[PDB]
Amino acid sequence: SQEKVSIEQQLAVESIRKFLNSKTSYDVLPVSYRLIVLDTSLLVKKSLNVLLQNSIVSAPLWDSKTSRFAGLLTTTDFINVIQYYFSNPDKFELVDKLQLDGLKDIERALGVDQLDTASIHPSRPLFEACLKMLESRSGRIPLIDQREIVVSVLTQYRILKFVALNCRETHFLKIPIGDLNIITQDNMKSCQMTTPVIDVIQMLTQGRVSSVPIIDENGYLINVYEAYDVLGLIKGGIYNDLSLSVGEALMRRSDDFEGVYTCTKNDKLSTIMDNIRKARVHRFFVVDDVGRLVGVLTLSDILKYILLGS
């Protein structure tokens, strides 16, 4: 019965909140882990190597001139670069010799500059860490303890994966996701396989979103272009592939790519949490009965639901 399912879900949710309010990020870190920091002087295209090389997608930056944490190197960083050299060709050398220090320079230059680098102390409750992340669409926050030092970076994914793995109450979230006003709908850009990658990459920036779905004349979801696909697109300095179509670009994707996940309005967060535990999912595209894009369920949407409710 619906109402019996509702009560079981609201209880399970309050419980998870009670969990996250009682533990600190510190409490959730491994007994021994590793942090990869990159010197501000390092070459942007060179930093692209280290990321892929160690299979990480972000890394904190340290300014040696000032002996301080210089922020978070992520994917948006590289995308900015792509739009620059694109709208400013014949400046290759300014891009090929660009350093992490100059990164802020290009960003704050042609194009709106995201001048924000959240951070939180390791002893604050985990629930508080999730709130700060719910602002920075990066969905990741560095734990900093002053003198400054980076203890670790915390991701939305690691959190959702922590709950799904340690909080049995996830088994009790059976309310169909469509009944939970969490799905993101209208205002979600899409494209076609033939669409030029720079235009898709451009869409990434603008709409300030991590992925752009690819549909057909009608609205069938065929695949998806994720901001992440940008790294491999420029491995150790590239600009050639910048003239291909999304369709062609997507062929650089590694043989080990897990694939795009979809679900429907009738799927339950129980099932969704289940899949987050079994794989590196970062979003679930919501298709209808025949496979037409209806919306998207982000980790953010999910995390936002678990903390503040629908």
Binding site: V37, D39, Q53, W62, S64, S67, R147, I149, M193, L221, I222, N223, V224, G232, K235, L244, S245, G247, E248, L250, M251, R252, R253, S254, D255, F257, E258, G259, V260, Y261, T262, C263, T264, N266, D267, T271, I272, N275, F284, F285
Partner: protein, 133 residues
């Protein structure tokens, strides 16, 4: 593979090979050229299979030039001060040898707060050696 009344799944057309295959079946000239993309050993201190005097010497050499200073010996241990002044200690070990670099404090845990500074100066000191030899 196992899943009940679930409706969560991997969009088959997004698996690399399949999409690769379809791109080729559509016959795009570029497509036939595009290939999939493919892909440490931490060691203690620094190794060197050379004479322990020419090693110990280049360390002091590289040092003096970097602005560092050391204490009066009377040995294979360097007690240096670099700059607040950062303390550090170098040890040589046994042929085949290893040079150990250890953080040791400040002057004019705290170790933790001084994680990068230390690693930075040790970085500079390695590059100085490299160029010399």
């Amino acid at each position: 593979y196992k899943e009940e009344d679930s409706t969560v799944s991997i969009l088959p057309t997004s698996l690399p090979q399949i999409h690769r295959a379809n791109m080729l079946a559509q016959g795009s000239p570029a497509a036939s050229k595009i290939s999939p993309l493919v892909t440490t050993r931490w060691h203690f201190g620094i190794r060197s299979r050379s004479y322990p005097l020419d090693v110990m010497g280049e360390i002091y050499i590289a040092l003096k030039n970097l602005g560092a200073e050391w204490a009066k010996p009377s040995l294979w241990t360097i007690k240096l001060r670099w700059k607040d002044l950062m303390k550090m200690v170098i040890q040589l070990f046994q042929n085949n040898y290893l040079v150990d670099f250890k953080f040791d404090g400040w002057e004019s845990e705290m170790s933790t707060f001084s994680a990068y500074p230390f690693l930075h100066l040790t970085t500079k000191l390695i590059m100085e050696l490299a160029v010399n030899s």
